[PDB]
């Protein structure tokens, strides 16, 4: 599923605080 997304880290949980991430 995730490895088809070109605009996201294919690893689960790439940021501890996702709301801090403006690019996700």
């Amino acid at each position: 599923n995730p490895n088809a997304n070109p605009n996201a880290n294919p690893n689960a949980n790439p940021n501890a605080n996702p709301n801090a991430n403006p690019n996700a």
Partner: antibody, heavy 121, light 113 residues
Framework: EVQLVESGGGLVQPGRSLRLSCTTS????????MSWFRQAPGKGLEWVGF??????????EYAAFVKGRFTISRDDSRSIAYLQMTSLKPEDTAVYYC????????????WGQGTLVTVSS | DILMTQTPLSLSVTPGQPASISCKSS???????????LYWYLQKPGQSPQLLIY???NRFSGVPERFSGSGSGTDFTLKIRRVEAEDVGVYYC?????????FGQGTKVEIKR
């Protein structure tokens, strides 16, 4: 204006290697995933691979027919994406396209003119 | 792989008349995030592909209003309201919910004079 220019294509003997470049201008190259496509003479469009922005790990994905042999790379300082091909087969003969993948529109949006690669003895 | 089959493969359209192109995928294109990863491309003769529609129904900027998309799940339709000479070429749908990204085989559109 967004510009993408493919180069490096030409006549290559089977089993040999060839590197294609996607030289870009008009945008911050590092922020975008770059994707490669190909089209055999008279055939449809075929996805080859893409490489993510280093903002998302900078890793690449590849089509089935293409793996082991091809490596997609990116030079963020020069704004150039690469398609490194190895052990080419006649079936790899195609126009190869590079494309800027959007963020709102997360697919191949802007395409270069393509570069013809001919694999033949 | 996800199979994408377009019907018909060829279309002869009287100028000013509509055209409809179907695309069927072997799996659903609706992802868990609520987006549907179906896109429509046009390749004019001797030209690079250009995007027409993203996510089933959305027009890329500068695409004429006579182009519209619709559908859901596994069945999608591209509609050209009033075909012109500029619309001649091969239309592809493309999915990217799954690797590899795959295209349909392409639907050729010509003017019927």
């Amino acid at each position: 204006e967004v510009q993408l220019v493919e180069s490096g294509g030409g006549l290559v003997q089977p089993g040999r290697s060839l590197r294609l470049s996607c030289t870009t201008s008009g945008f911050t190259f590092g922020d975008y995933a770059m994707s490669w496509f190909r089209q055999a003479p008279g055939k449809g469009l075929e996805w080859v691979g893409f490489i993510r922005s280093k903002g998302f790990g900078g890793t690449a994905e590849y089509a089935a027919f293409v793996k082991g042999r091809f490596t997609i790379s990116r030079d963020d300082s020069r704004s150039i994406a690469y398609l490194q091909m190895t052990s080419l087969k006649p079936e790899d003969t195609a126009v190869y396209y590079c494309s800027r993948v959007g963020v709102v529109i997360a697919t191949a949006v802007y395409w270069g003119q393509g570069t013809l690669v001919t694999v033949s003895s | 792989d996800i199979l994408m089959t377009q019907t018909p493969l060829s279309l002869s359209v009287t100028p000013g008349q509509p055209a409809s192109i179907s695309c069927k995928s072997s799996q659903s294109l609706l992802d868990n995030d609520g987006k549907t990863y179906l896109y429509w491309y046009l390749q004019k003769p001797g030209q690079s592909p250009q995007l027409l529609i993203y996510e089933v129904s959305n027009r890329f900027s500068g695409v004429p209003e006579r182009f519209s998309g619709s559908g859901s799940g596994t069945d999608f339709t591209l509609k050209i309201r009033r075909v012109e000479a500029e619309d001649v070429g091969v239309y592809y749908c493309m999915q990217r919910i799954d690797l590899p990204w795959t295209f349909g085989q392409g639907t050729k559109v010509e003017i019927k004079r």
